[PDB]
Amino acid sequence: AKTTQEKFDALKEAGVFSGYPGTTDAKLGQDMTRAEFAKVLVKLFGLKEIHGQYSYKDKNYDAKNWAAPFIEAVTAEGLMQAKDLTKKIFDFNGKITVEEASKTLVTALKLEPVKDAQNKATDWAKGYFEAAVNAGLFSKDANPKANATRAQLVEAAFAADEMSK
Ligand SMILES: CO[C@@H]1O[C@H](CO)[C@@H](O[C@@H]2O[C@@H]3CO[C@](C)(C(=O)O)O[C@H]3[C@H](O)[C@@H]2NC(C)=O)[C@H](O)[C@H]1NC(C)=O
C-alpha cells in the first residue's frame, strides 16, 4: 500500500516518470499536459520514440521541444490524435480531461467499455469512464469532465503498469 508520492517514486525508478529538471517537486496537484500524457503513454505501452520528424505546425513544436519524440510516437500509434486534423495542431501545453484519459487508457489496455454506463461523463466517454473506474484507473467520484491532475495520472499509470506486467 503506497501514497501517490510513493507511486510516483516507484514509477520514476521504473523510468515511466522522471519529474521536472532542477526540482524534486513532482507537482502532483497541477493539471497534466497533453505532452506529459504522450510521454507516460510511450513508457507504459513500450512505444518507439520518433526523433527528427514533426507532424504538427504548433509554434515551438520542433527539435527544441522535448515532447516531440513522444507526441510523434502516440500520433503514429493512434493513442492520441490532433486537436485540429486540418491545421495539424497538437496543442502540447493543452490539458486532458479524466474522461479523455479514461478512453485512451481503457483502449490501450484492451479493456471493453461498459454498455449503458450510469455516470456524469460526456455521452462518448460514459462506457470508458465506467470501465476505467472498474479497473481502478480513476476514482468513481472523479469529475470525468475535469482536467486530470498529475496525481490522477500517477495513480492511473501505477495501476496500468501493474495490470500490464
Ligand atoms: C523548458 O520546459 C521544460 O522542459 C523540460 C525538459 O527539458 C520538461 O521536462 C519534462 O517534464 C515532464 C513532466 O512530466 C513527465 C510525465 C514526468 O515524468 O513527470 O514527463 C517529464 C519529461 O520526461 C521531462 N522531464 C525531464 C526531467 O526531462 C519540462 O516539463 C518543461 N517545463 C515546462 C514548464 O513546460
Side-chain angles (χ1 to χ4, degrees), residues 1-164:
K2 294 167 186 286
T3 66
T4 304
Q5 181 68 57
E6 282 170 350
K7 285 179 179 187
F8 172 91
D9 290 346
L11 286 169
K12 188 165 182 188
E13 187 167 37
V16 173
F17 281 77
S18 58
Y20 296 87
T23 184
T24 60
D25 187 7
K27 305 194 195 162
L28 295 178
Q30 80 183 26
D31 298 344
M32 189 170 275
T33 66
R34 286 165 53 72
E36 290 172 351
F37 191 47
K39 198 282 289 251
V40 174
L41 286 173
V42 164
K43 296 299 185 176
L44 281 177
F45 297 109
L47 307 187
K48 285 323 199 83
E49 296 177 30
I50 306 168
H51 295 261
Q53 164 186 298
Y54 313 94
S55 298
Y56 299 104
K57 286 192 180 163
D58 304 47
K59 190 201 168 166
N60 299 319
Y61 190 78
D62 50 43
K64 294 285 295 130
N65 196 308
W66 70 266
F70 305 102
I71 289 167
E72 291 302 315
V74 295
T75 294
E77 191 74 28
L79 289 203
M80 297 185 74
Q81 299 171 281
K83 188 182 193 170
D84 187 338
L85 262 183
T86 304
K87 286 200 149 183
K88 309 182 177 169
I89 301 295
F90 188 73
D91 191 16
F92 54 78
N93 287 326
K95 303 315 179 289
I96 185 139
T97 66
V98 167
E99 69 185 3
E100 274 185 272
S102 295
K103 175 164 194 187
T104 300
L105 289 172
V106 163
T107 299
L109 290 167
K110 306 191 204 77
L111 291 166
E112 225 52 59
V114 179
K115 212 173 199 292
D116 286 63
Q118 304 296 112
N119 61 51
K120 291 172 285 189
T122 315
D123 54 4
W124 63 263
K126 287 180 183 301
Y128 290 102
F129 181 61
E130 201 73 11
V133 169
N134 288 347
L137 294 172
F138 291 103
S139 178
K140 63 185 189 67
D141 295 305
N143 178 2
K145 291 161 188 282
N147 295 342
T149 64
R150 288 177 54 79
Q152 280 171 314
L153 265 294
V154 164
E155 291 286 329
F158 190 87
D161 178 79
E162 186 180 302
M163 289 186 287
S164 301

